[PDB]
Amino acid sequence: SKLDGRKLDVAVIGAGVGGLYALHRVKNELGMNAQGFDDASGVGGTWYWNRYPGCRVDTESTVYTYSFDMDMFQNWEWSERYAKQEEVLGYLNAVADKHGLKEAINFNTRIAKMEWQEEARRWRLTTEAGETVTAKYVIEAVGLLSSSYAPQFPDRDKFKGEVLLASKWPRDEPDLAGKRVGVVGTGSTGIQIITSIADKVGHLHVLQRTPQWVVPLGVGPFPKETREKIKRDPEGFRDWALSTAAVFGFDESTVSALEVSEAERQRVYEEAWQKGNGFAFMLETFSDIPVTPEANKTATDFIKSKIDSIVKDPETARKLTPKEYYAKRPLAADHYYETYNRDNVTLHDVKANPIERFTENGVMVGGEEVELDVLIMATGFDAMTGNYLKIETVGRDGVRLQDEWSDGPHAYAGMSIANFPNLLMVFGPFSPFTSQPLVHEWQVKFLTNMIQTAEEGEGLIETSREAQEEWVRVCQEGMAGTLFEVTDSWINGANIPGKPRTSMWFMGGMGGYMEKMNEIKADNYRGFSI
Ligand SMILES: Cc1cc2nc3c(=O)[nH]c(=O)nc-3n(C[C@H](O)[C@H](O)[C@H](O)COP(=O)(O)OP(=O)(O)OC[C@H]3O[C@@H](n4cnc5c(N)ncnc54)[C@H](O)[C@@H]3O)c2cc1C
Ligand SMILES: NC(=O)c1ccc[n+]([C@@H]2O[C@H](COP(=O)([O-])OP(=O)(O)OC[C@H]3O[C@@H](n4cnc5c(N)ncnc54)[C@H](OP(=O)(O)O)[C@@H]3O)[C@@H](O)[C@H]2O)c1
């Protein structure tokens, strides 16, 4: 192998949003000998793999975009407000084409192991094919929502049909027309598939373990007026977006739902309902919706009244009504609840009627057979830690990341890990809960500036255990003051049997994150030893 034996300054793991910019920064902007690695055959990460029907971003294309190339930031002709998967993938390919990244990426190359060599001051990487690559620094951009999860029901051998994984959709597009199709899952992926295929399949069986509080997305044209605002001052727009908590293209509300009149609550929620977008409904309306049960109930009572008015069959309306708080990743899709009024859609509550096993012709659900041609798993991810822990990662004195993270992840600022020198993450665990591209850019700029500083001397970046544990503690405390603390979902690991259930996010928003990180940088990179 020509790769075998290669010696790099920087290895970038991943060629999604994070890895592409990380590689551009170290190779093109900083002039380092750097290459990327991805098990995918091309760039795009998320947008390369998730080719399922209806896949689309929930962040407006004004903010789900790079800003580092100011020409593309102001002039890329996004076709609509919320870009579909193919368009995002096309954009990432155009970025990689323009900046010569593909020639510096080793595609179809999975990193199986990385081991710190203290005397050599290098990381030794082993690919799945057994090739050895060394790098002074590793920038790990393997994604928080990249390790697919799907239950394996008994007797799959008996089933004559197809079982598809939405997050690793087949490269040859499946034929769904006229078929009996089951969808397992009603998170963001499931609701996109459901609304995309309901009028194409012969019959759609929605296998719903837990309904969530869906609001409209507001699919529509690209906001020309925001783009005019950007062109006055694209850096100012970028900086404004980063100053918000979620970086979703709006200012979060500072008004408590409980300090206004009932008429104002109704006005605000109706306005947000017509505007669309789940993050806006949860955060642009009032300030305390995911904080107190009383405020949360004003929002869910509103959504419940919509469900009841839309869904013709009352029992179906009740099955679509969650019992949990509105305290998961907020969901949005257009014409969602109306789907259940179709004569070819059946909703199954598979908490009350569990999926028991496969049969020859379908699936057993609460004691009755549901005949299926196709079963689509929209079941999410071993989130946050899944793909980090798939790389055997050996740090100082042989310490294994698998052991360090045995009770949950521990990391400093979502970018470094104590006992793993010169290993930097893009948007790792304990990052802020934000839209990702503009925040990836900010983090990449922060960590590559640390690399450049390290390269002026010894070339060693170590992170303090105490700083890491204090960062983790701040994230735990922030979660513990919200309803996310008492609402199980992938956000706290509860969706994976056996997985530690714990806080894994910084909860102060991007504005608060940057303030903390800038204070750390100003205090001679407190918690880092460079
Ligand atoms: C359906 C879906 C919709 C989403 N919508 C939004 C949205 O609207 N707004 C938003 O902000 N975020 C959204 N996200 C989050 C999305 O993950 C991020 O926006 C972003 O795409 C993540 O980029 P990344 O580079 O961090 O990781 P990824 O996109 O996951 O890319 C990581 C790449 O590295 C590969 N890789 C992993 N391990 C290895 C290894 N050992 N060796 C070699 N290669 C490896 C992976 O296979 C992958 O190709 C969505 C995610 C999904 C799945
Ligand atoms: N529109 C977008 O921008 C978009 C689209 C897709 C994904 N994403 C991102 O990716 C994240 C994950 O979304 P996702 O929908 O793929 O996954 P998800 O939010 O984890 O939802 C998974 C769904 O599958 C059900 N599920 C999991 N295991 C199951 C099992 N054994 N048996 C039956 N049902 C099971 C889950 O029910 P339970 O609730 O009972 O566990 C849930 O309804 C999103 O929250 C979001 O951050 C964004």
Side-chain angles (χ1 to χ4, degrees), residues 13-19 37-40 44-47 49-50 52 55 57-59 64 109-111 141-143 145-146 329 381 387 391 434-437 440:
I13 310 185
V17 171
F37 299 80
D38 201 317
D39 63 337
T46 294
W47 308 106
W49 294 110
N50 288 272
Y52 62 81
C55 180
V57 88
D58 265 16
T59 306
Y64 198 92
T109 303
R110 181 166 147 171
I111 301 307
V142 298
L145 290 167
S146 53
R329 196 274 191 180
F381 300 88
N387 260 341
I391 304 172
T434 61
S435 79
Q436 291 191 220
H440 286 203

mmCIF file of all heavy atoms in Angstrom, residues 13-19 37-40 44-47 49-50 52 55 57-59 64 109-111 141-143 145-146 329 381 387 391 434-437 440, ligand 1:
data_model
loop_
_atom_site.group_PDB
_atom_site.id
_atom_site.type_symbol
_atom_site.label_atom_id
_atom_site.label_comp_id
_atom_site.label_asym_id
_atom_site.label_seq_id
_atom_site.Cartn_x
_atom_site.Cartn_y
_atom_site.Cartn_z
ATOM 1 N N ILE A 13 -9.657 12.518 10.799
ATOM 2 C CA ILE A 13 -10.531 11.353 10.681
ATOM 3 C C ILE A 13 -11.947 11.848 10.425
ATOM 4 O O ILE A 13 -12.569 12.437 11.314
ATOM 5 C CB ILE A 13 -10.478 10.478 11.941
ATOM 6 C CG1 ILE A 13 -9.033 10.181 12.327
ATOM 7 C CG2 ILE A 13 -11.221 9.166 11.706
ATOM 8 C CD1 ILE A 13 -8.938 9.219 13.496
ATOM 9 N N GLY A 14 -12.465 11.588 9.232
ATOM 10 C CA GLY A 14 -13.805 12.004 8.824
ATOM 11 C C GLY A 14 -13.713 13.041 7.716
ATOM 12 O O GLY A 14 -12.852 13.924 7.741
ATOM 13 N N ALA A 15 -14.609 12.930 6.731
ATOM 14 C CA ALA A 15 -14.721 13.893 5.639
ATOM 15 C C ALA A 15 -16.157 14.392 5.529
ATOM 16 O O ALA A 15 -16.650 14.675 4.428
ATOM 17 C CB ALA A 15 -14.249 13.299 4.311
ATOM 18 N N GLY A 16 -16.838 14.499 6.670
ATOM 19 C CA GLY A 16 -18.081 15.233 6.753
ATOM 20 C C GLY A 16 -17.802 16.708 6.978
ATOM 21 O O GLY A 16 -16.682 17.188 6.799
ATOM 22 N N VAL A 17 -18.848 17.429 7.395
ATOM 23 C CA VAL A 17 -18.752 18.874 7.628
ATOM 24 C C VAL A 17 -17.511 19.219 8.440
ATOM 25 O O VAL A 17 -16.747 20.129 8.085
ATOM 26 C CB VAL A 17 -20.026 19.395 8.317
ATOM 27 C CG1 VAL A 17 -19.828 20.837 8.765
ATOM 28 C CG2 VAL A 17 -21.218 19.324 7.353
ATOM 29 N N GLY A 18 -17.291 18.500 9.538
ATOM 30 C CA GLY A 18 -16.183 18.848 10.416
ATOM 31 C C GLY A 18 -14.828 18.525 9.819
ATOM 32 O O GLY A 18 -13.917 19.356 9.837
ATOM 33 N N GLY A 19 -14.674 17.314 9.288
ATOM 34 C CA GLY A 19 -13.380 16.908 8.761
ATOM 35 C C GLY A 19 -12.955 17.698 7.538
ATOM 36 O O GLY A 19 -11.764 17.937 7.329
ATOM 37 N N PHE A 37 -9.191 10.970 6.269
ATOM 38 C CA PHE A 37 -9.543 9.559 6.165
ATOM 39 C C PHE A 37 -11.042 9.427 6.348
ATOM 40 O O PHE A 37 -11.612 10.060 7.236
ATOM 41 C CB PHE A 37 -8.839 8.720 7.225
ATOM 42 C CG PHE A 37 -7.353 8.762 7.115
ATOM 43 C CD1 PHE A 37 -6.640 9.839 7.622
ATOM 44 C CD2 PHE A 37 -6.673 7.763 6.450
ATOM 45 C CE1 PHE A 37 -5.274 9.906 7.485
ATOM 46 C CE2 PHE A 37 -5.295 7.817 6.317
ATOM 47 C CZ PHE A 37 -4.598 8.892 6.827
ATOM 48 N N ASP A 38 -11.683 8.621 5.507
ATOM 49 C CA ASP A 38 -13.107 8.380 5.704
ATOM 50 C C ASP A 38 -13.424 6.991 5.190
ATOM 51 O O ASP A 38 -12.922 6.586 4.141
ATOM 52 C CB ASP A 38 -13.975 9.425 4.988
ATOM 53 C CG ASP A 38 -15.383 9.517 5.568
ATOM 54 O OD1 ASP A 38 -16.003 8.472 5.860
ATOM 55 O OD2 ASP A 38 -15.868 10.654 5.745
ATOM 56 N N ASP A 39 -14.258 6.259 5.929
ATOM 57 C CA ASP A 39 -14.687 4.967 5.415
ATOM 58 C C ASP A 39 -15.668 5.108 4.248
ATOM 59 O O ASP A 39 -15.830 4.159 3.468
ATOM 60 C CB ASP A 39 -15.261 4.107 6.556
ATOM 61 C CG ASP A 39 -16.513 4.686 7.197
ATOM 62 O OD1 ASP A 39 -16.754 5.907 7.132
ATOM 63 O OD2 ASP A 39 -17.269 3.892 7.800
ATOM 64 N N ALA A 40 -16.289 6.273 4.090
ATOM 65 C CA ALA A 40 -17.128 6.559 2.936
ATOM 66 C C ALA A 40 -16.298 6.609 1.653
ATOM 67 O O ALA A 40 -15.090 6.855 1.675
ATOM 68 C CB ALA A 40 -17.843 7.896 3.125
ATOM 69 N N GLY A 44 -18.895 13.977 2.695
ATOM 70 C CA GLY A 44 -20.238 14.363 3.067
ATOM 71 C C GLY A 44 -20.691 13.874 4.418
ATOM 72 O O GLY A 44 -21.610 14.456 5.008
ATOM 73 N N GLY A 45 -20.066 12.807 4.906
ATOM 74 C CA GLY A 45 -20.424 12.236 6.195
ATOM 75 C C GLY A 45 -21.903 11.935 6.265
ATOM 76 O O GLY A 45 -22.413 11.163 5.451
ATOM 77 N N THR A 46 -22.585 12.511 7.258
ATOM 78 C CA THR A 46 -24.039 12.464 7.391
ATOM 79 C C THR A 46 -24.763 12.474 6.053
ATOM 80 O O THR A 46 -25.650 11.648 5.799
ATOM 81 C CB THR A 46 -24.496 13.662 8.221
ATOM 82 O OG1 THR A 46 -24.002 13.508 9.551
ATOM 83 C CG2 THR A 46 -26.013 13.758 8.222
ATOM 84 N N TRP A 47 -24.401 13.426 5.195
ATOM 85 C CA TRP A 47 -25.121 13.652 3.950
ATOM 86 C C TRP A 47 -24.731 12.671 2.859
ATOM 87 O O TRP A 47 -25.417 12.602 1.839
ATOM 88 C CB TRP A 47 -24.898 15.102 3.512
ATOM 89 C CG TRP A 47 -25.231 15.970 4.663
ATOM 90 C CD1 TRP A 47 -24.358 16.638 5.475
ATOM 91 C CD2 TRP A 47 -26.532 16.156 5.222
ATOM 92 N NE1 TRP A 47 -25.050 17.274 6.486
ATOM 93 C CE2 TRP A 47 -26.387 16.996 6.349
ATOM 94 C CE3 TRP A 47 -27.815 15.724 4.858
ATOM 95 C CZ2 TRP A 47 -27.472 17.409 7.114
ATOM 96 C CZ3 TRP A 47 -28.892 16.126 5.625
ATOM 97 C CH2 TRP A 47 -28.715 16.964 6.741
ATOM 98 N N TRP A 49 -24.256 9.287 3.841
ATOM 99 C CA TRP A 49 -24.856 8.050 4.335
ATOM 100 C C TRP A 49 -26.378 8.090 4.398
ATOM 101 O O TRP A 49 -27.036 7.101 4.047
ATOM 102 C CB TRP A 49 -24.330 7.733 5.734
ATOM 103 C CG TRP A 49 -22.870 7.420 5.784
ATOM 104 C CD1 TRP A 49 -21.889 8.195 6.331
ATOM 105 C CD2 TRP A 49 -22.221 6.245 5.284
ATOM 106 N NE1 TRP A 49 -20.667 7.578 6.197
ATOM 107 C CE2 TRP A 49 -20.848 6.371 5.575
ATOM 108 C CE3 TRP A 49 -22.670 5.090 4.637
ATOM 109 C CZ2 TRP A 49 -19.917 5.400 5.215
ATOM 110 C CZ3 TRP A 49 -21.741 4.113 4.297
ATOM 111 C CH2 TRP A 49 -20.384 4.286 4.575
ATOM 112 N N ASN A 50 -26.951 9.202 4.863
ATOM 113 C CA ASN A 50 -28.386 9.280 5.158
ATOM 114 C C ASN A 50 -29.152 9.655 3.893
ATOM 115 O O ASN A 50 -29.611 10.784 3.721
ATOM 116 C CB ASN A 50 -28.643 10.298 6.262
ATOM 117 C CG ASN A 50 -28.182 9.825 7.604
ATOM 118 O OD1 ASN A 50 -28.924 9.166 8.332
ATOM 119 N ND2 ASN A 50 -26.942 10.159 7.952
ATOM 120 N N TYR A 52 -32.012 8.423 2.856
ATOM 121 C CA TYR A 52 -33.359 7.906 2.965
ATOM 122 C C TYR A 52 -34.383 8.896 2.411
ATOM 123 O O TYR A 52 -34.099 10.089 2.259
ATOM 124 C CB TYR A 52 -33.649 7.569 4.426
ATOM 125 C CG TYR A 52 -33.583 8.759 5.368
ATOM 126 C CD1 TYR A 52 -34.661 9.623 5.477
ATOM 127 C CD2 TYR A 52 -32.462 9.004 6.155
ATOM 128 C CE1 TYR A 52 -34.631 10.701 6.316
ATOM 129 C CE2 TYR A 52 -32.425 10.097 7.017
ATOM 130 C CZ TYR A 52 -33.517 10.943 7.082
ATOM 131 O OH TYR A 52 -33.520 12.021 7.942
ATOM 132 N N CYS A 55 -34.968 12.934 3.402
ATOM 133 C CA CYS A 55 -33.925 13.462 4.263
ATOM 134 C C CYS A 55 -33.638 14.917 3.915
ATOM 135 O O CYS A 55 -33.464 15.274 2.745
ATOM 136 C CB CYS A 55 -32.663 12.627 4.140
ATOM 137 S SG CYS A 55 -31.358 13.274 5.202
ATOM 138 N N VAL A 57 -32.353 18.925 5.960
ATOM 139 C CA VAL A 57 -31.890 19.650 7.128
ATOM 140 C C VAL A 57 -33.064 20.388 7.783
ATOM 141 O O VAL A 57 -34.042 20.754 7.120
ATOM 142 C CB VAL A 57 -30.764 20.580 6.631
ATOM 143 C CG1 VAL A 57 -31.299 21.887 6.156
ATOM 144 C CG2 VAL A 57 -29.608 20.707 7.605
ATOM 145 N N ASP A 58 -33.002 20.552 9.112
ATOM 146 C CA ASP A 58 -33.966 21.344 9.870
ATOM 147 C C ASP A 58 -33.439 22.723 10.216
ATOM 148 O O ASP A 58 -34.147 23.508 10.853
ATOM 149 C CB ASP A 58 -34.335 20.635 11.171
ATOM 150 C CG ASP A 58 -35.572 19.820 11.045
ATOM 151 O OD1 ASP A 58 -35.990 19.551 9.890
ATOM 152 O OD2 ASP A 58 -36.129 19.455 12.107
ATOM 153 N N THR A 59 -32.191 23.000 9.867
ATOM 154 C CA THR A 59 -31.565 24.297 10.047
ATOM 155 C C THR A 59 -31.624 25.034 8.716
ATOM 156 O O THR A 59 -31.293 24.457 7.681
ATOM 157 C CB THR A 59 -30.114 24.104 10.500
ATOM 158 O OG1 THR A 59 -30.076 23.271 11.666
ATOM 159 C CG2 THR A 59 -29.482 25.421 10.825
ATOM 160 N N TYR A 64 -27.032 26.763 7.937
ATOM 161 C CA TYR A 64 -26.435 25.438 7.713
ATOM 162 C C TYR A 64 -25.579 25.503 6.452
ATOM 163 O O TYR A 64 -25.971 25.088 5.360
ATOM 164 C CB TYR A 64 -27.486 24.328 7.625
ATOM 165 C CG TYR A 64 -26.832 22.970 7.833
ATOM 166 C CD1 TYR A 64 -26.746 22.403 9.099
ATOM 167 C CD2 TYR A 64 -26.243 22.290 6.772
ATOM 168 C CE1 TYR A 64 -26.108 21.178 9.300
ATOM 169 C CE2 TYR A 64 -25.595 21.074 6.960
ATOM 170 C CZ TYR A 64 -25.539 20.517 8.227
ATOM 171 O OH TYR A 64 -24.873 19.314 8.419
ATOM 172 N N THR A 109 -11.308 4.187 3.702
ATOM 173 C CA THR A 109 -10.228 3.870 4.635
ATOM 174 C C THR A 109 -10.755 4.099 6.047
ATOM 175 O O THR A 109 -10.887 5.242 6.485
ATOM 176 C CB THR A 109 -9.003 4.728 4.345
ATOM 177 O OG1 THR A 109 -8.609 4.528 2.979
ATOM 178 C CG2 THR A 109 -7.857 4.370 5.274
ATOM 179 N N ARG A 110 -11.074 3.025 6.752
ATOM 180 C CA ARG A 110 -11.547 3.139 8.124
ATOM 181 C C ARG A 110 -10.364 3.043 9.075
ATOM 182 O O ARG A 110 -9.533 2.140 8.948
ATOM 183 C CB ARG A 110 -12.570 2.049 8.447
ATOM 184 C CG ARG A 110 -13.114 2.131 9.868
ATOM 185 C CD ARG A 110 -14.363 1.269 10.092
ATOM 186 N NE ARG A 110 -14.420 0.738 11.456
ATOM 187 C CZ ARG A 110 -15.464 0.108 11.989
ATOM 188 N NH1 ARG A 110 -16.597 -0.048 11.321
ATOM 189 N NH2 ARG A 110 -15.369 -0.378 13.227
ATOM 190 N N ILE A 111 -10.287 3.973 10.022
ATOM 191 C CA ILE A 111 -9.262 3.911 11.057
ATOM 192 C C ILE A 111 -9.750 2.944 12.125
ATOM 193 O O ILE A 111 -10.819 3.141 12.713
ATOM 194 C CB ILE A 111 -8.972 5.298 11.648
ATOM 195 C CG1 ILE A 111 -8.507 6.249 10.539
ATOM 196 C CG2 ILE A 111 -7.890 5.182 12.709
ATOM 197 C CD1 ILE A 111 -7.338 5.689 9.730
ATOM 198 N N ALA A 141 -12.953 13.838 13.660
ATOM 199 C CA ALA A 141 -14.219 14.445 13.267
ATOM 200 C C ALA A 141 -15.164 13.338 12.806
ATOM 201 O O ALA A 141 -15.665 13.334 11.682
ATOM 202 C CB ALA A 141 -14.012 15.492 12.168
ATOM 203 N N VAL A 142 -15.411 12.381 13.709
ATOM 204 C CA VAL A 142 -16.141 11.169 13.353
ATOM 205 C C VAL A 142 -17.637 11.302 13.569
ATOM 206 O O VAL A 142 -18.370 10.341 13.306
ATOM 207 C CB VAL A 142 -15.612 9.957 14.145
ATOM 208 C CG1 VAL A 142 -14.149 9.700 13.795
ATOM 209 C CG2 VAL A 142 -15.772 10.185 15.643
ATOM 210 N N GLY A 143 -18.113 12.456 14.035
ATOM 211 C CA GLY A 143 -19.539 12.696 14.156
ATOM 212 C C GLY A 143 -20.161 12.216 15.452
ATOM 213 O O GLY A 143 -19.772 11.167 15.989
ATOM 214 N N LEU A 145 -23.545 11.723 15.519
ATOM 215 C CA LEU A 145 -24.763 11.053 15.070
ATOM 216 C C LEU A 145 -24.403 10.227 13.844
ATOM 217 O O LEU A 145 -24.949 10.383 12.753
ATOM 218 C CB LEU A 145 -25.878 12.062 14.781
ATOM 219 C CG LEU A 145 -26.458 12.734 16.034
ATOM 220 C CD1 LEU A 145 -27.325 13.940 15.662
ATOM 221 C CD2 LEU A 145 -27.265 11.733 16.836
ATOM 222 N N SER A 146 -23.435 9.336 14.042
ATOM 223 C CA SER A 146 -22.820 8.608 12.942
ATOM 224 C C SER A 146 -22.781 7.110 13.152
ATOM 225 O O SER A 146 -22.672 6.375 12.162
ATOM 226 C CB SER A 146 -21.393 9.116 12.729
ATOM 227 O OG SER A 146 -20.708 9.043 13.967
ATOM 228 N N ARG A 329 -34.812 16.435 21.314
ATOM 229 C CA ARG A 329 -34.470 17.240 20.150
ATOM 230 C C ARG A 329 -35.759 17.622 19.424
ATOM 231 O O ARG A 329 -36.509 16.729 19.011
ATOM 232 C CB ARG A 329 -33.551 16.458 19.211
ATOM 233 C CG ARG A 329 -32.827 17.301 18.159
ATOM 234 C CD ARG A 329 -33.653 17.506 16.903
ATOM 235 N NE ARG A 329 -32.843 18.074 15.830
ATOM 236 C CZ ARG A 329 -33.302 18.361 14.625
ATOM 237 N NH1 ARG A 329 -34.580 18.201 14.321
ATOM 238 N NH2 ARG A 329 -32.458 18.823 13.704
ATOM 239 N N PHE A 381 -29.211 6.519 16.577
ATOM 240 C CA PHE A 381 -27.767 6.396 16.671
ATOM 241 C C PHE A 381 -27.327 6.088 18.087
ATOM 242 O O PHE A 381 -27.941 6.530 19.057
ATOM 243 C CB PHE A 381 -27.103 7.695 16.203
ATOM 244 C CG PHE A 381 -27.428 8.037 14.793
ATOM 245 C CD1 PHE A 381 -28.553 8.786 14.490
ATOM 246 C CD2 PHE A 381 -26.647 7.554 13.761
ATOM 247 C CE1 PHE A 381 -28.880 9.070 13.191
ATOM 248 C CE2 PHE A 381 -26.966 7.846 12.446
ATOM 249 C CZ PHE A 381 -28.089 8.596 12.169
ATOM 250 N N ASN A 387 -19.065 6.395 17.632
ATOM 251 C CA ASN A 387 -17.976 6.216 16.688
ATOM 252 C C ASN A 387 -16.618 6.520 17.296
ATOM 253 O O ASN A 387 -15.615 6.010 16.800
ATOM 254 C CB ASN A 387 -18.210 7.046 15.432
ATOM 255 C CG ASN A 387 -18.761 6.205 14.311
ATOM 256 O OD1 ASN A 387 -18.637 4.980 14.336
ATOM 257 N ND2 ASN A 387 -19.346 6.838 13.320
ATOM 258 N N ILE A 391 -13.132 3.253 17.429
ATOM 259 C CA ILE A 391 -11.690 3.275 17.206
ATOM 260 C C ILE A 391 -11.004 2.899 18.506
ATOM 261 O O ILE A 391 -11.137 3.608 19.507
ATOM 262 C CB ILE A 391 -11.208 4.654 16.743
ATOM 263 C CG1 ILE A 391 -11.959 5.104 15.493
ATOM 264 C CG2 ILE A 391 -9.684 4.601 16.490
ATOM 265 C CD1 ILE A 391 -11.654 6.549 15.106
ATOM 266 N N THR A 434 -26.097 22.928 19.396
ATOM 267 C CA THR A 434 -26.208 24.005 18.417
ATOM 268 C C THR A 434 -26.306 23.393 17.030
ATOM 269 O O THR A 434 -26.011 22.211 16.841
ATOM 270 C CB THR A 434 -24.972 24.911 18.448
ATOM 271 O OG1 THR A 434 -23.836 24.106 18.117
ATOM 272 C CG2 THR A 434 -24.769 25.537 19.824
ATOM 273 N N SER A 435 -26.692 24.210 16.044
ATOM 274 C CA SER A 435 -26.434 23.789 14.676
ATOM 275 C C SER A 435 -24.928 23.621 14.497
ATOM 276 O O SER A 435 -24.124 24.207 15.227
ATOM 277 C CB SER A 435 -26.995 24.786 13.660
ATOM 278 O OG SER A 435 -26.155 25.916 13.524
ATOM 279 N N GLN A 436 -24.540 22.796 13.541
ATOM 280 C CA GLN A 436 -23.149 22.364 13.652
ATOM 281 C C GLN A 436 -22.161 23.094 12.738
ATOM 282 O O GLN A 436 -21.095 23.487 13.232
ATOM 283 C CB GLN A 436 -23.070 20.844 13.476
ATOM 284 C CG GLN A 436 -23.705 20.131 14.683
ATOM 285 C CD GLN A 436 -23.441 18.627 14.742
ATOM 286 O OE1 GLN A 436 -24.336 17.845 15.086
ATOM 287 N NE2 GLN A 436 -22.220 18.220 14.439
ATOM 288 N N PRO A 437 -22.440 23.336 11.446
ATOM 289 C CA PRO A 437 -21.366 23.862 10.574
ATOM 290 C C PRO A 437 -20.671 25.123 11.080
ATOM 291 O O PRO A 437 -19.433 25.153 11.111
ATOM 292 C CB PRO A 437 -22.093 24.093 9.244
ATOM 293 C CG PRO A 437 -23.131 23.013 9.234
ATOM 294 C CD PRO A 437 -23.639 23.005 10.656
ATOM 295 N N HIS A 440 -18.684 24.101 14.221
ATOM 296 C CA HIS A 440 -17.493 23.373 13.786
ATOM 297 C C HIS A 440 -16.385 24.323 13.360
ATOM 298 O O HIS A 440 -15.217 24.132 13.715
ATOM 299 C CB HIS A 440 -17.812 22.445 12.620
ATOM 300 C CG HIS A 440 -18.580 21.228 13.008
ATOM 301 N ND1 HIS A 440 -18.567 20.076 12.251
ATOM 302 C CD2 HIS A 440 -19.412 20.990 14.048
ATOM 303 C CE1 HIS A 440 -19.343 19.172 12.822
ATOM 304 N NE2 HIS A 440 -19.868 19.701 13.911
HETATM 305 C C1 LIG B 1 -30.540 12.789 9.062
HETATM 306 C C2 LIG B 1 -29.648 13.763 9.831
HETATM 307 C C3 LIG B 1 -30.109 15.085 9.723
HETATM 308 C C4 LIG B 1 -29.389 16.141 10.368
HETATM 309 N N1 LIG B 1 -29.866 17.521 10.294
HETATM 310 C C5 LIG B 1 -29.115 18.549 10.942
HETATM 311 C C6 LIG B 1 -29.564 19.968 10.893
HETATM 312 O O1 LIG B 1 -30.592 20.271 10.301
HETATM 313 N N2 LIG B 1 -28.796 20.966 11.567
HETATM 314 C C7 LIG B 1 -27.552 20.619 12.265
HETATM 315 O O2 LIG B 1 -26.880 21.471 12.812
HETATM 316 N N3 LIG B 1 -27.129 19.234 12.303
HETATM 317 C C8 LIG B 1 -27.911 18.221 11.663
HETATM 318 N N4 LIG B 1 -27.461 16.895 11.739
HETATM 319 C C9 LIG B 1 -26.229 16.630 12.488
HETATM 320 C C10 LIG B 1 -25.106 16.331 11.492
HETATM 321 O O3 LIG B 1 -24.531 15.164 11.952
HETATM 322 C C11 LIG B 1 -24.110 17.483 11.486
HETATM 323 O O4 LIG B 1 -24.794 18.616 10.965
HETATM 324 C C12 LIG B 1 -22.910 17.203 10.617
HETATM 325 O O5 LIG B 1 -23.318 16.636 9.378
HETATM 326 C C13 LIG B 1 -21.921 16.289 11.319
HETATM 327 O O6 LIG B 1 -20.672 16.402 10.627
HETATM 328 P P1 LIG B 1 -19.400 15.663 11.182
HETATM 329 O O7 LIG B 1 -18.278 15.952 10.236
HETATM 330 O O8 LIG B 1 -19.200 16.069 12.610
HETATM 331 O O9 LIG B 1 -19.719 14.086 11.261
HETATM 332 P P2 LIG B 1 -20.276 13.132 10.117
HETATM 333 O O10 LIG B 1 -21.174 13.829 9.150
HETATM 334 O O11 LIG B 1 -20.996 12.006 10.810
HETATM 335 O O12 LIG B 1 -18.997 12.630 9.298
HETATM 336 C C14 LIG B 1 -18.065 11.733 9.958
HETATM 337 C C15 LIG B 1 -17.470 10.843 8.858
HETATM 338 O O13 LIG B 1 -16.432 10.229 9.377
HETATM 339 C C16 LIG B 1 -16.661 8.690 9.130
HETATM 340 N N5 LIG B 1 -15.985 7.929 10.135
HETATM 341 C C17 LIG B 1 -16.440 7.647 11.380
HETATM 342 N N6 LIG B 1 -15.518 6.859 12.004
HETATM 343 C C18 LIG B 1 -14.504 6.686 11.130
HETATM 344 C C19 LIG B 1 -13.332 5.970 11.269
HETATM 345 N N7 LIG B 1 -12.824 5.197 12.356
HETATM 346 N N8 LIG B 1 -12.445 5.916 10.243
HETATM 347 C C20 LIG B 1 -12.709 6.581 9.056
HETATM 348 N N9 LIG B 1 -13.877 7.290 8.925
HETATM 349 C C21 LIG B 1 -14.768 7.335 9.982
HETATM 350 C C22 LIG B 1 -17.972 8.552 9.199
HETATM 351 O O14 LIG B 1 -18.461 7.282 8.573
HETATM 352 C C23 LIG B 1 -18.498 9.777 8.443
HETATM 353 O O15 LIG B 1 -18.508 9.585 7.115
HETATM 354 C C24 LIG B 1 -28.223 15.827 11.079
HETATM 355 C C25 LIG B 1 -27.782 14.491 11.187
HETATM 356 C C26 LIG B 1 -28.496 13.468 10.544
HETATM 357 C C27 LIG B 1 -27.981 12.038 10.660
#
